[PDB]
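Fold this: cGMP-dependent 3',5'-cyclic phosphodiesterase
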Amino acid sequence: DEYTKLLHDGIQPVAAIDSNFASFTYTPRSLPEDDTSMAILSMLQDMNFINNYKIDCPTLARFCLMVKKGYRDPPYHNWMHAFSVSHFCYLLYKNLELTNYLEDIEIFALFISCMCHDLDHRGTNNSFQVASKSVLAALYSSEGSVMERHHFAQAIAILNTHGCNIFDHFSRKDYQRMLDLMRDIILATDLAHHLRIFKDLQKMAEVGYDRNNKQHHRLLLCLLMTSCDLSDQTKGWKTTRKIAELIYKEFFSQGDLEKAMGNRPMEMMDREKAYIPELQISFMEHIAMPIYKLLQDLFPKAAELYERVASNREHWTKVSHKFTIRGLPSNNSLDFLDEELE
Ligand SMILES: Sc1ccc(Cc2ccc(Cl)cc2Cl)nn1
Ligand SMILES: [Mg+2]
Ligand code: NA
Ligand SMILES: [Zn+2]
């Protein structure tokens, strides 16, 4: 039983999970899925949020289980994505020393937002609102349908479930503050939102981060959230390769249906038009690398993250020069590439 087992698991120290658990080299997708709820509790305890906010541990256990259950099983947008995004939030706390830059409550909200940010994703994305089917239209678009309102609504539905409100003992002001933070942070996972605020993020990085500037706190939270969402690109080759398989398996299931029903899919969802290495390069150069470059500009200790993403972009570039990979094979695996690179 998940609940009894999670109650019996108490709250472990992070040293009981792995000595590298707080390292940027750690791959949280290596952790067995049955141990991830325990790891969530361990991270919250290690960041001192359980004690400092007087969180009821049974209520938190139930909350964690409800959030996990609120994910479906498409290839990419599942609980293991939310878990690995949440783990990266913890890595930023530990390695960038976020308490020196943000309030305790903003960091707590960021972590809970990471857990909840893709709730009830069904492996479909019809959000781009572009007339072209080109990947470039998608990579530049700053408007869309905002699916992220639903993810937030699912989070609030969990909090409004009897026995699951981890914040119900908060003051009315702190309760509203937490929910407003969750809304803003979850809405920030929309790439259209990121593209709307990009110029303001650049301006912040140019002038320098001001810990006394409240607009800078807002912008930084958005940047950190997107950096958590894309953190699979900051690990090694095997992670970026595996995640590309998942992203495109998910995309192609949508696109295959759209094509079958006589509709034009986005080109990145059309297995006949989607050159995966080239698409990965484009996403990394347009979206991911600039995010981690901004992060490095604000936090010199984040330099290794940018350099990992850049290294992974160069791996995909080598792949693109040696292979023409249009769509995915019938088994959805490009794992032969691991031996090709070394
Ligand atoms: S790391 C990563 C993350 C997402 C995607 C798919 C993808 C998603 C959105 C856009 Cl606008 C473009 C692409 Cl190509 N690919 N790689
Ligand atoms: Mg999302
Ligand atoms: Na996503
Ligand atoms: Zn996500």
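The radius of gyration is 20 Å. The longest helix spans residues 237-260.
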